[PDB]
Symmetry: C3
């Protein structure tokens, strides 16, 4: 049972951090690892692996740590690193971190990720607020008759607050695919036709799980590379991490400021 | 063995109803539960759970009953409620009811469902004949080299008969998704681009199985809500059932008049 | 570990053929079985089933044999027949033949298949070079952080060589679907919108695996039928095999000549 597992994880989080309840949770994706320090001074740092139900992250660029950080008037859970469906894990494990965070009191989830940019106006290193998503995985983290509405899955209010921190922030539709292979140029052209502005291999299930659990979501993609076929240059995860590092300072500052506005 | 399991179920149906063979089968979807009265008076009513191979439905609004009803010159098998892929069962179980009906003698399957309306003309409460479908589940109920043709999956002949009952019935293409989460507005815009007029989380596999088993199919979607993002109002299953209830008498009467024409 | 299984198979292949290493591998798809003769005189012919990791092909038209044939200056592994995801096997098995071929020394994979034609200028019996693909299976043969780039998945260089053999060769985008049911006309219209020129139920995963393993790929689809809904006539696998047979002489001559140019 996902709920009981989440509660057990939340209890351990409370016991180890000494904080009975957190207010916000942030998941740092590929390329975002170095932005963790700017969020603030952690009062607790521990391995995600220690927590019940947490499959340790294994992808390059994911620290696999959980930090408790005070940001503004909030106590924030920072999930440095995440796991993905392409790693072979049942979605119950993929969305467990968000569910555990919710069980720990977090009613706002800030989901960040590295994405390929499909819209012509997007440049490498640019942060893009996720306005909506396209779940192209043919899967759902929900089982049974859990008919969750996804109309304002990415809270307009939170995107407005982000815009208050930095007015220049653009928005875009994120397409979530299975992965782990990158897309072919033809698939990218297809995604453009489908209305996608960004492409990645995560986030969508976590967003669905968050909404199902009653939490709001702010999604932020860092354009770590132009989508396959745009430049013709081959994609590389190492380069994705490098591109993310170049914007780490701005990203950390952005997250710290926006969260404090919540 | 799917076929043998279907034969066993068909035998129990014959013994329990006292009817050696049925001619038509109707699967009542979400919101269609109370349409049974308008179909006619059952001569036998029994729990699906008591039939070999039948996984009991669990979604709200699905009774999980089987009724034998005389409609016109036909002996009709009415499956009040269905199971869906989002409930986690292998497709063999999802399409078993249709295969059991075929084994019971039904050469015509009337598959009804609750669907979100995407096309501009559609209104809540409007019945729509399924002209074709878009299987967007990345799955198939068929295994191995069962290369079944789906050119006229939804019999033009049956749609013609349906229009004799109600000349104003409109047609539309049904998009079948995994579920159980409702679609995001972006996904709905994507489906419109793909050619979808209706969207649901069932039916496609049942239609495929019916075709593979030599049965004709008449699909009827009841627009229980406008697709996500159309009205901007959040979708709700309880509201889907309420919408269905408001049109149940009309739907039952429609089904009765159409089936009598078979 | 797929790589270890691949090496083991490669060792058995070397022992059984008396050839320490092969240079090119060709997978003959549906309808291509009779094209074998034109490739040359095999020095060894053995059942795929007798090789480690090879799940025996079962689809009609797939011989399930492995032949070592000298073509031009190359020692070629000819895989007469393949397995498909619709047969229910884990993708590790679906791409094993290609990985085994790579482990045996093949740095070039010629993947042939039978496909439905969507583009108006394509005719039944026409061979079409695959310029790119659309993986619409919601799956990948890769696991974990295998972030493989698919920018030039179908080697432009190899397509140029094929063109030297037959200058009139057309190119097109191949859409890979789960199968085994054929597409509905509405689905075909959708595929056209997505940019597909050809449609089939194989190849994409093999191409991805080949790329991840460092081999170039030349994809050749034989239009064995026009896509569902184009003619209005139902599709049939037996007819697909018949269409393939009608072009077998041309296909075999094409393959023999192109491979000699590698
Ligand atoms: O262009 C892209 N396509 C698909 N995924 C990604 C990503 C994300 N980064 C990781 C691969 O580098 C993977 O976890 C994926 O979700 C960055 N750029 C792209
Ligand atoms: O807008 C919609 N999108 C997807 N499914 C449905 C449905 C059908 N009704 C059920 C959810 O209420 C579910 O089984 C689904 O198949 C009604 N409206 C919609
Ligand atoms: O029109 C078509 N649609 C989908 N697959 C195929 C095929 C290929 N041939 C086989 C079915 O005949 C199957 O393995 C599929 O990959 C030929 N024509 C079509």
């Amino acid at each position: 049972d996902p709920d009981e597992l989440a509660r057990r994880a939340a209890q351990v989080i409370a016991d180890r951090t000494g904080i009975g309840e957190h207010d916000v949770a942030v998941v740092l994706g590929s390329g975002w690892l170095p932005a963790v320090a700017a969020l603030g001074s952690p009062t607790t740092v521990l391995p995600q692996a220690e927590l019940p139900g947490f499959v340790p992250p294994t992808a390059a660029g994911h620290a696999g740590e959980l930090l408790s950080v005070p940001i503004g008037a909030h106590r924030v859970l920072v999930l440095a690193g995440r796991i993905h469906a392409y790693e072979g894990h049942d979605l119950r494990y993929v969305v467990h971190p968000v569910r555990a965070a919710r069980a720990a009191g977090a009613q706002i989830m800030v989901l960040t990720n590295a994405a390929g940019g499909l819209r012509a106006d997007l440049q490498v290193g640019q942060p893009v607020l996720i306005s909506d998503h396209l779940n192209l995985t043919a899967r759902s983290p929900l089982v049974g008759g859990e008919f969750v509405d996804l109309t304002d899955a990415y809270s307009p209010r939170l995107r407005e607050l982000a815009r208050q921190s930095d007015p220049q922030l653009a928005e875009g539709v994120y397409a979530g695919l299975p992965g782990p292979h990158y897309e072919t140029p033809a698939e990218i052209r297809m995604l453009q036709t489908l209305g996608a502005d960004l492409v990645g291999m995560s986030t969508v299930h976590e967003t669905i799980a968050a909404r199902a659990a009653g939490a709001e979501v702010l999604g932020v993609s860092l354009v770590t590379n132009l989508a396959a076929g745009i430049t013709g240059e081959p994609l590389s995860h190492a380069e994705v991490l490098a591109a993310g590092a170049a914007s780490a300072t701005r990203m950390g500052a952005l997250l710290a400021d926006v969260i404090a506005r919540f």
